[model samples]
Target: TCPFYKKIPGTGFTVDAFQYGVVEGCTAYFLTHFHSDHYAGLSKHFTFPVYCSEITGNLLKNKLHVQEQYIHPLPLDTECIVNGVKVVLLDANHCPGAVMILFYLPNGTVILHTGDFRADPSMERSLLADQKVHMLYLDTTYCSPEYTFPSQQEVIRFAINTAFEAVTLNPHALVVCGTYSIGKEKVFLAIADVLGSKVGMSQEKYKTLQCLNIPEINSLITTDMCSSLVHLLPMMQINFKGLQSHLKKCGGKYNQILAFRPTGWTHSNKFTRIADVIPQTKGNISIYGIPYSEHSSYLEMKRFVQWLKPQKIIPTVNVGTWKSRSTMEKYFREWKLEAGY
Candidate 1:
């Protein structure tokens, strides 16, 4: 069995495998998910046909906008014998196109690779209930005891309530919220559930939400229409000065305040002090943080690792950072974590 790629330093050398390897003779190849870490070195190196679930294929096409000449989109529950490997796609509830892959070799060796998975009941019920597999590769980013995250429903509620309170408190202030184009959509949905008719979002975000086709959520405003609100806009839409000027001309009917959610990793804790950027309305910009995240928490990570009982579990993602690694190792030791590679 080949050791999985768990951790990669800035230089791109993985904990086990070479940073880049040729797959010339390999007849079958599988991709577990579309995360940057998992799929970064692909495409440029592998010319052979690669297999992935429909969701993963669509995500790579739509979200990352990648084009691969040799992609074979496999359906879930159906078995595909590419060359000789029997591959199946299982659901991963992390994101829209996320998936866990199970590869059955000719020798009957079953290898399961969880590509950035979580332990939500929905995920377990939908994907991995009553399944038997031999070897499993898992996502161990949150394998720490101290980190505990609230439930998804609870986080949604808190974000909505906080946004509503901020808007209600400042009826005449422009509220700027932020999140990645995809990640922030949930925040908008939660807030829209509260504000109803008063919710205003850019047309791109609206179209994005529509394209996602989420259930029981529909509210938006075009960027052109948002000009009636305030002189300021989210950093992503800052290029639209025309909108800002239009708001000034329209007498600022969109005046209202709410919290902001920055998207992507560069928005570190230092960015929480964004209020300093407001030259004219420093005091008026009300900001609050709801500890909601799509990533797994330390406690959740611990529980998931315990449940899987893999032969060897290795932490991924933020494990190399001194503080993050140390904090996670505390929980790893508690569970008698063993190195997989």
Candidate 2:
């Protein structure tokens, strides 16, 4: 199993991975966001007082059934004390409620756990301008050099243009956009707003978005698929079998179906500097993968690390072996050298 918990040498605090039952011995707990992978073991049954963004805490209580008393709402850019440690939350820019946690230990060592974030220029100027980070637990999901991708905004524009073009060419086609349950909400909203159409969502997804209470989302979401030209489905529900199931349900309502997936994996193995629209056709379905991602690419990671100038870097996820750790260290060395530090 992939390990998710990390403990500061003497602080007795744990980051994420609460599902592993490590809370009893820790002083306090922190959750970056509500993504299933990051929040694997959390549920309504959890009793530990967990700190997260206000929206995330609301989702935990309203969507996941966690008790309100056990949920603590952390406002961004505000500092709060937990078990005597100064904790500050910063916008992670990944999803609506995602955050990068900063901890100031009593021993004068500052630690940062980037719970899945995309590099933001404002965040760098705000947090790293005057402070020195002693240890940085990074989200190295796209740490490899081959994983370079365009900014999220640029990809969103491309997706909108692509979907608009497809619909303009084939007015009888149904447009399907694939996204994670919590992320890529912007893509769906943008498509609906720009195309002057309504978007349908599954009941479960609708409820999750409702709990988020985002103004734009509240105005654009609907549970009825037949009423809208665009259908927003979870990424997990976009494969071959899933597409067939959707077709069976639609029952020849539309002449053709066009699918678009906005994810970083589209450029994973390809060498493209700018974002390109890659298309793949299976049977009667047409799917396009766009390189819109929330995680930092290798170049972004290098710039972030160099800007922060953390003394030591720790890979948060997928650091399962010695080789993985060594690879990160090599990158760190290369970045430092390149930055002329």
Candidate 3:
């Protein structure tokens, strides 16, 4: 429950979901990203004013049908006053237009909401210059040591090369790249550009790319499956059962279907390697899971906390499971403690 909703002490600002109808008395609302978990209760019927990055605002308005009057768009790296609190948005590097929020409180305290971001050196330098952080709301998605993975660029390169090899081996194959609705445009766009083939996408994803205004990417969108050698499918649609059914319907038209999912979960303890390619049905449909994630790893989180030296750290996700206060204390006990509650 705590993870789904959190109040920013005395500021009357609520982060993430408005569960239990907490929107009534909130002074302002902040959306970290457009992920469903972060935006569970939000919809076209939302009455309260919401503040988010310009791209996120566009998604909310166009995709969710949120009224324009109720949406406030903020530019990245720019400070503005909202509800008497000085706020700035920093590039989160998780997805296009994702941001980390910084709040300058009336009590001279600075609060940071990471909003599901990977560590960035430039952003770190900017935040460190402030020299003091009263409190930090951390994204603890990968809080365990077993979550280490390579950089996203490296993973993307590996994926593209693998797809190329798969296509070379099976000329009649349909290379299906699995991605979330908004986050993994980089993989699809890169494949399209390098392979010189248009990528087919669902209408919803096509509209999202259109709003993102990346001409090179938008131009690759195609509705017809046979328009290109590769098809960009949502991650949810890439499964054994679904693939089997699709292949059955195709009736051997395609020599193979190579599906790859770019995610960090593939690096868990169950798998020894950073990337694992599992073949299903003797190479007819191969599914590969790569270690590509947008969240910070455990070591990265430790480094971030050590660098920031915040007075207190509040875990945003897994609050109830981790018991928030005690978990952070035990996990970060090695770091020198100065500020008191």
Candidate 4:
């Protein structure tokens, strides 16, 4: 998405609009999460003031080396005034610290700015869900019908069981968790719990996990790679070429590579039984494309818009081209009419 809709219509407040230089106004900034696409232009100087959750703040300092004084870590579910507008942050459920911001404008308009989030039952019953928002800034990452993935809970359970079964069969196989930042933590964290073994990661990845500060997760991670059969590696490692090379590098200790590439984009609404969760194999290498997405599916977007009843929806993704953007808006129009809003 461009910086066109970055600033709120009435207020100078910017939401994830770091790339177009520092905002000239007081520029109360909202960084949804630590994802690169969301915080692209924030420099090391990082003079602009930004707000996010505590976990996002910690990771920002570690990854960007920004000054601590600039970060304002707000408590969740609490409303505060910034530039005379009421603001609140709700968990986005996309990543550990991702949030969907709610801005209550002075003119009795309530606008919801969803950075990048997936839907759940709890969100519909949340504080602002019934508030009748005037506008919605949505993360329409999957606004089309083609991207219908399974529920997160079912996918995670399947991933955990699959990894457990694979490792049990091949005792000498290395379980590779294809991960990046805060996405898919539930998948591999449960894999760690079910496998009951130490997990390996680099110093950077280990420190990022520590920022999340989960007790169960901390006990499982190790900086020593060889100490654990399940190692947390970059998402690229799960690719065919990468995993194939990595499997050979492990020598006699590990003969097979069982990688879980867990993301919603991995699978469509297609399959028959849990056997569809089978791994794509090449020689001793195997990769499981788990439907563990952090973004809402097509039906999810439809259900939310119908439930939210917002006066208007302003999509925040797929804005690069007119065709895709037009398509998303069509869905929005269809949903709005169906919901009678």
Candidate 5:
């Protein structure tokens, strides 16, 4: 049906296991990150042994709570030969659960798939040591020179300091911060470490944080402890009908109601739309914008390509086409697009 393993429009392959076809003879697919876009198609069909990092496996289990049984957990840096393919997972540094995948085909083809990675110290070290990389699937989400973002640590520090000051000034109010259920688990952990006390978090968040292999920090609380200090909840949790009332009753002693929301859109009017949901207060609920994202910026992407100095690069994700590809193409020997198809 589809040419060259299904040869889907952008990814350049069609007979992938997730697609509608018989994936016979295909060894396996390496999942590089926990983003839904990266792994959504797996549910379209089943494969005998799906491989992913332990962190990613936990995330998939959390997202698709019921389908946890299907995943075959793999440890980081431990190479495994399955169905005639050698697969290894390396740190991607984009998010807590993010990873880069390396596949060594039996025919001597070496493929390195970078799902999404910011140019951090950890990622830089990993790429520098990588010598066998033949075909690289790169992340080019921020392709333009103008897009610049702060590091995850910097963003977390800013968020904690901002919230801490607000709550101290108005001790009688509750502060609510928004973050991804899984994506921003690092931020939550950072806040917990800074507080060194039980910060309010839903039961689910608590459980997810606990699953980390070596979680250094483990301070979190729930709605019941809202009165003790600042109240932190995932952005999606705001959808609950009784959440506001619950916070109000628990925060009766506090004077200021501060909320922090981490989002990709730093300069957008969407914040106005959410105003309807966040009730106005006499003291006022100040919404602060923190430019935090897991994807690499245009500058970071360019620098990463230059650092890796790969023979050939394949761009994937929102890195766009032509212009962005050309940006890396100029530095690298050969650059192309196949991840989108």
Candidate 6:
């Protein structure tokens, strides 16, 4: 088990167990999402009952090859029983199978754990208004003053317009969108729909998208290389040298390459989001570092915690060393809320 993994209070269960050893006294394990970092320790050799969303269960069995018998798929917004504890799964709004689980212990304490998410106003309106959260397990990935990017919708629209303007500058440009294993589908889908272009990516990546069974996904992605000018590639690979190699690989088809590498690190509280994006251009390749992300910003986290006003907070990230953990704990104190770290 990694240092961040923690057992739910008064229960023999662990959530997002970095605990490949099946933490002693753990009766069951809950996976909040299928992201590799949260599921680092799970393997075929592991033996224990696992709780996760339906799509995540499929990924566990088919992708990571975890045994199907131990997998218990929970539906969203419904209560389920595990060791007599009431558990409800809600959309984390991070990735396809991600969720924020509310564990209602028999003791009447409601522990809401946000595995990983982008905070939105609709979340409280949708389901969070249903509980009086006693302890909140939060994803504080960007809890510091490092970021506050525009909303997911803003990033999608920005990416689309950026691509459109780049096309005007270089009509024979190949727009390659940098992507991840599961997230960032919204950005690419928007480019495909809005720009009237077919988005291209590996068949394997598209197959991963299939696991979501997302009806919200439009008919905009195609794997055929020769058909789509807009394609998806590893985000980091959209750089200078990578573009040259990619351009050569495309032969003479595209005279220029316009790529967007989307991530949160590009955002900061010192500035605000508007129409323009910082550009890096050289020769026939131009790449934009887009401040698009799925994790909640510092301000967003503050708003969420403030509105919920839980009895105490326990961070799920940035807690490796004692000093590091205390830095985040100090943040809670400054917010005038309690910290149970």
Which one wins on TM-score? 4
Worst 10 residues of 2 by lDDT: 267-276
lDDT of 5 by residue, 1-40 (tens): 3234122222222222354344445444456666655565
Q: What lDDT score is found at residue 311 in candidate 2?
A: 83
Rank candidates, TM-score, best first: 4, 2, 6, 3, 5, 1
Q: Point out where model 4 deviates above 4 Å.
A: 248-251, 266-274
Off by over 4 Å in 5: 1-25, 41-47, 61-69, 127-130, 192-196, 214-218, 221-223, 236-251, 265-283, 319-341
> Model 1 misses residue 57 by how many Å?
2.5
- Which 10-residue window of candidate 4 scores lowest in summed lDDT? 266-275
Better of 2 and 3 by TM-score: 2
RMSD of each: 7.1, 2.3, 3.0, 2.0, 6.4, 2.8
lDDT of each: 0.52, 0.79, 0.75, 0.81, 0.58, 0.80
Q: Give the alpha carbon lDDT tens digit for every residue of 1-341 in model 4.
A: 33657778778688888887757664688899888888888766888678888888888888788888898888899988877788999998888888989988888888899899997768987787557788888889888887777777888788788888888987887888888667777777788778888888889888888887576666878898877888887987778898877767666689888888876674344544444666788888888777777898888877877888888778888888989988987888888777777
Whole-structure CA lDDT of model 3: 0.75
Per-residue lDDT over 224-329 for candidate 3, one digit per residue giving the tens place of the 0 to 100 score = 7666777777688788776766666555678678887776665353555445545445446678776667888777877777777787777776666546556666
Cα RMSD (Å) between model 6 and the true structure? Answer: 2.8
Instruction: Give the TM-score (vs. native) of candidate 6.
Output: 0.91
Which pairs of residues collide in model 1? 173-256, 178-261
TM-score per candidate = 0.67, 0.92, 0.89, 0.93, 0.75, 0.91
What TM-score does prediction 1 earn? 0.67
After superposing candidate 6, which stretches have Cα over 4 Å from the reference?
1-5, 216-218, 267-269, 337-341
Candidate 5: deviation at residue 114, Å? 0.7
Distance from true location, Cα of 308 in model 3, Å:
1.0
The top-ranked prediction according to lDDT is 4
